[PDB]
Design a protein around this ligand. Structure first.
Ligand SMILES: N[C@@H](Cc1cc(I)c(Oc2cc(I)c(O)c(I)c2)c(I)c1)C(=O)O
Ligand SMILES: N[C@@H](Cc1cc(I)c(Oc2cc(I)c(O)c(I)c2)c(I)c1)C(=O)O
Lengths: 127, 127
């Protein structure tokens, strides 16, 4: 079930790909925020992508309550590190989570220096 | 377009397309912000896409100085009018505007209910 600050059924996963190199985007920083009652963004979780370009264990079912979340992906530092000066400061994904019960969320991002695409895969959890 | 203190020399243009229907995304709101001293976001420009999914005359070359800009596109509103339940609260594009490079910026967004792609076209010539 839940847990409380780690990785329940993995309710939140992030996957980043590099469209220039045809590979996972490794060591990409990220930051997740939750909108608090006062309308500010409070820190919720952060991590870096693995060699497979994925980030797991950001949260648990218990901690991942109903709310508005923002996933910031630090695309700028990734590209600079490669010798490329990209267009965007970062990629942001803002969505309401769990408003009709708990769901599992996969945020995928595909990166190019002047372009990014993002998609969400939402699953009604556990089989 | 005209000019003065921001609004029509076409240094900045937004184009929004709908991938479900294969058309321009019309009457989409957006809002442009410029980052200020205090690291907060100051209103800068706003409008709604036209019949061709475009927004022009947001600023002028005199007003468009070097800085960090954020373009926020009200995608949630668009999909709700179509009776489709979207994933994203909105789409956000954050970039640095630099005098060195080309002077005309085209920001294009391709919208789907659970996905969006954004690209920047930076040029010397015209749109
Ligand atoms: N281990 C995770 C990793 C993973 C998720 C997705 I979602 C995916 O599919 C796409 C398709 C396109 I097109 C993209 O631009 C991107 I990024 C990801 C792929 I490959 C791998 C999983 O499988 O659970
Ligand atoms: N009247 C404007 C309309 C317009 C501008 C662009 I730039 C464009 O090109 C792309 C390509 C892809 I691929 C996208 O996902 C998107 I959104 C836009 C298209 I089509 C139409 C003009 O012609 O001036």
């Amino acid at each position: 079930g839940p847990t409380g600050t780690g990785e329940s059924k993995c309710p939140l996963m992030v996957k980043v790909l590099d469209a220039v190199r045809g590979s996972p985007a490794i060591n990409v920083a990220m930051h997740v925020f939750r909108k608090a009652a006062d309308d500010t963004w409070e820190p919720f979780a952060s991590g870096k992508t693995s060699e497979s370009g994925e980030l797991h264990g950001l949260t648990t079912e218990e901690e991942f309550v109903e709310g508005i979340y923002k996933v910031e992906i630090d695309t700028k530092s990734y590209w600079k590190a490669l010798g490329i000066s990209p267009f965007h400061e970062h990629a942001e994904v803002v969505f309401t989570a769990n408003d009709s019960g708990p769901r599992r969320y996969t945020i995928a991002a595909l990166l190019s220096p002047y372009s990014y695409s993002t998609t969400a895969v939402v699953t009604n959890p556990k089989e």
